[PDB]
Amino acid sequence: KVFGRCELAAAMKRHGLDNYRGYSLGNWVCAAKFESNFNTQATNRNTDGSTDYGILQINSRWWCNDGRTPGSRNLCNIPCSALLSSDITASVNCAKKIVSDGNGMNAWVAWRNRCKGTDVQAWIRGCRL
């Protein structure tokens, strides 16, 4: 599923991400924009052989099991494929656990490089929430 901007903002708000750990909704939408272009089916391979999955590009090195990342953790305890569903629930729950592990949203490179310190509220302007 390729979300519309406001559509994803609303699905995200409903799943408890607005102001989660102090990160306003614009942050999550901005990160999703640049991690996945709002596409739940996005996958990207990393140099170390781990893979990033879904709307928020969650890494199999630590967070999900994909059966092809030797020595990795499965800290969200899910198959990585569940992160590709059109239902963003699993991606959201895993993201909450990530954002809470000490480093906040800096875990997302694209957030760090393209969202942090910008006007993220712009990402939810116009939306009915």
Q: Binding of Cl ion at residue 104 (CB under 5 A)?
A: yes
Q: Look at the block and give the residue holding tokens 């924009």.
A: 33
Known catalytic residue at 7: no
| Residue 101 in marked binding region | yes
Residue number, 79 or 104, with CB nearest to Cl ion:
104
Per-residue mark of binding to Na ion, 30-69 (x: CB under 5 A)? ------------------------------x----x---x
Assess 112 for contact with Cl ion (CB under 5 A).
no
What residue 104 binds from Na ion, Cl ion, none (CB within 5 to 8 A, per partner kind)? Cl ion
Q: How many CA atoms lie within 13 A of 20 on its CB side?
A: 24
Binding Na ion by CB under 5 A: which of 72, 83, 123, 124? 72
Angle at 104 between CA 101 and CA 110, to 5 degrees: 125
The two structure tokens encoding residue 19: 């102001």
DSSP reduced 3-state for 16: coil
39 has which bridge partners? 2
CB of 20 to Cl ion, least distance (A): 10
Tell me the backbone φ, ψ of residue 114, rounded to 5 degrees: -135, -5
119 catalytic per annotation: no
34's enclosing H/E stretch is: helix 25-36
79 binds Cl ion (CB under 5 A): no
Annotation: binding site for substrate: 101
Active site residues: 35, 52
Annotation: binding site: 101
